[PDB]
């Protein structure tokens, strides 16, 4: 909407206070004009029609329980925009500052979040498996990264390409979580998963097997559930990414870590210059090796480490 840029204040899902960019025209709307062509947050009102209504508030204060998922979706979309712009020189998900749209309060007891082809969508959870999912910065960045993937490599959402698609979202979700630097880790969704259980998460990149996911190509799932295991087999690539960054010895294969920034540069280049809609794991290995070669040179430690990591997870 047309209006003047303002700064509201509120509390997120975890009870933390933050400032948010809003727009004033009669009401204060969750419309952040400071980033690209805007970040817009909508109320789905417990229903499934999308996007719902642009979030309107009378006083620019967002401290109601109902406000919390909107505050975090809006704010963490901003952080994710900043990561892509500042770290990768990418302007929004399409590279041309497309408006970023999110809807919260989707459906009832909805234990998931997704990119629907046009926007991000967040359930509130059922209060047992999840609390409102926008409370996780890794979750928000995971969802926006699906949009980046769709506009770039275009990895088809099934089987190996789909598992790469998922891993790309977990990798950048995690790198955004480190960028914001609040309780960062290599776990996925820990901030909004199972409020009654401490110390767990939906997935782990450092040890995917902790939550039943494969950490070696020999353990890949090839059934039909979960689109051919896109959230399962992602563990193989998540493990490789973790090893590239942090190092370690996995099934006897030692990897020299090169750090998060270089992991991010290598995978961003692979995503945007080499991967295609049908890439499999072997082709991802080749893309990451080529990307590291471009950035650091054929004889570099970075290239050697990428090879070590894929060797470690059984991907040739
Ligand atoms: C980071 C998580 C908290 C949320 C994350 N959600 P996600 O991977 O975006 C869900 N994916 C999804 O719904 O894809 C199906 C789809 C939806 C809409 C259009 C096209 C395809 C997840 O791992 N979900 C688990 C699952 O769906 O099994
Ligand atoms: Ca208010
Ligand atoms: Ca964390
Ligand atoms: Ca995390
Ligand atoms: Ca938990
Ligand atoms: Zn996903």
From Swiss-Prot:
Q: Mainly resides where?
A: secreted
Temperature profile of activity? Answer: Thermostable.
Provide the binding site for Ca(2+) 2. Answer: 138, 177, 185, 187, 190
The reply on keyword Secreted is yes
Alphabetical GO biological process terms: proteolysis
Q: Which reaction does it catalyse?
A: Preferential cleavage: Xaa-|-Leu > Xaa-|-Phe
EC no.? 3.4.24.27
Required co-factor?
Answer: Ca(2+); Zn(2+)
Quick one: which residues bind Zn(2+)?
Answer: 142, 146, 166
- Annotated keywords: Calcium, Hydrolase, Metal-binding, Metalloprotease, Protease, Secreted, Signal, Zinc, Zymogen
Domain of life according to the entry: Bacteria
EC top class, as a word: hydrolase
Does the entry feature the keyword Secreted, yes or no? yes
Q: What function does this protein fulfil?
A: Extracellular zinc metalloprotease.
Protein known as: Thermolysin
Parent-record interval covered? 233 to 548 of 548
């Amino acid at each position: 909407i047309t209006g003047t840029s303002t700064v509201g204040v509120g509390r997120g899902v975890l009870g933390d206070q933050k400032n948010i960019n809003t727009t004033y025209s009669t009401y204060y709307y969750l419309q952040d004009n400071t980033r690209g062509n805007g970040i817009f947050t909508y109320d789905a009102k417990y229903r499934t029609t999308l996007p719902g209504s642009l979030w309107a508030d009378a006083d620019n204060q967002f401290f109601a329980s109902y406000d919390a998922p909107a505050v975090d979706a809006h704010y963490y979309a901003g952080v994710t925009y900043d990561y892509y712009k500042n770290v990768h020189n990418r302007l929004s998900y399409d590279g041309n500052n497309a408006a970023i749209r999110s809807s919260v309060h989707y459906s009832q007891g909805y234990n998931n979040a997704f990119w629907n082809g046009s926007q991000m969508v967040y359930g509130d959870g059922d209060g047992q498996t999840f609390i409102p999912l926008s409370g996780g910065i890794d979750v928000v960045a995971h969802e926006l990264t699906h949009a980046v993937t769709d506009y770039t490599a275009g990895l088809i959402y099934q089987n190996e390409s789909g598992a790469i698609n998922e891993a790309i979202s977990d990798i950048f979700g995690t790198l955004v979580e480190f960028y914001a630097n609040k309780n960062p880790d290599w776990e996925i969704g820990e901030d909004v998963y199972t409020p009654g259980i401490s110390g767990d998460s939906l997935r782990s990149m450092s040890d995917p097997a902790k939550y039943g996911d494969p950490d070696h190509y020999s353990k890949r799932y090839t059934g039909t559930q979960d689109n051919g295991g896109v959230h399962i087999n992602s563990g193989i690539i998540n493990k490789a990414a973790y090893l590239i960054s942090q190092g370690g010895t996995h099934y006897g294969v030692s990897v020299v870590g090169i750090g998060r920034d270089k992991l991010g540069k290598i995978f961003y280049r692979a995503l945007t210059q080499y991967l295609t809609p049908t890439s499999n794991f072997s082709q991802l290995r080749a893309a990451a090796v080529q990307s590291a070669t471009d950035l650091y040179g054929s004889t570099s430690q970075e290239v050697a480490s990428v090879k070590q990591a894929f060797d470690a997870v059984g991907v040739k």
